[PDB]
């Protein structure tokens, strides 16, 4: 739901 703090690259490329 709410946007949480992302770490590195989630799964993007």
mmCIF file with all atom_site columns, C-alpha atoms in Angstrom:
data_model
loop_
_atom_site.group_PDB
_atom_site.id
_atom_site.type_symbol
_atom_site.label_atom_id
_atom_site.label_alt_id
_atom_site.label_comp_id
_atom_site.label_asym_id
_atom_site.label_entity_id
_atom_site.label_seq_id
_atom_site.pdbx_PDB_ins_code
_atom_site.Cartn_x
_atom_site.Cartn_y
_atom_site.Cartn_z
_atom_site.occupancy
_atom_site.B_iso_or_equiv
_atom_site.pdbx_formal_charge
_atom_site.auth_seq_id
_atom_site.auth_comp_id
_atom_site.auth_asym_id
_atom_site.auth_atom_id
_atom_site.pdbx_PDB_model_num
ATOM 1  C CA . UNK A 1 1  ? 0.000  0.000  0.000   1.00 0.00 ? 1  UNK A CA 1
ATOM 2  C CA . UNK A 1 2  ? 2.237  2.788  1.297   1.00 0.00 ? 2  UNK A CA 1
ATOM 3  C CA . UNK A 1 3  ? 5.620  3.267  -0.370  1.00 0.00 ? 3  UNK A CA 1
ATOM 4  C CA . UNK A 1 4  ? 8.394  2.003  1.918   1.00 0.00 ? 4  UNK A CA 1
ATOM 5  C CA . UNK A 1 5  ? 12.065 2.987  1.825   1.00 0.00 ? 5  UNK A CA 1
ATOM 6  C CA . UNK A 1 6  ? 13.783 0.986  -0.914  1.00 0.00 ? 6  UNK A CA 1
ATOM 7  C CA . UNK A 1 7  ? 17.275 -0.520 -0.365  1.00 0.00 ? 7  UNK A CA 1
ATOM 8  C CA . UNK A 1 8  ? 19.413 -0.982 -3.462  1.00 0.00 ? 8  UNK A CA 1
ATOM 9  C CA . UNK A 1 9  ? 17.774 -1.915 -6.764  1.00 0.00 ? 9  UNK A CA 1
ATOM 10 C CA . UNK A 1 10 ? 14.595 -3.909 -5.837  1.00 0.00 ? 10 UNK A CA 1
ATOM 11 C CA . UNK A 1 11 ? 14.446 -5.891 -9.084  1.00 0.00 ? 11 UNK A CA 1
ATOM 12 C CA . UNK A 1 12 ? 14.800 -3.220 -11.758 1.00 0.00 ? 12 UNK A CA 1
ATOM 13 C CA . UNK A 1 13 ? 17.466 -3.343 -14.469 1.00 0.00 ? 13 UNK A CA 1
#
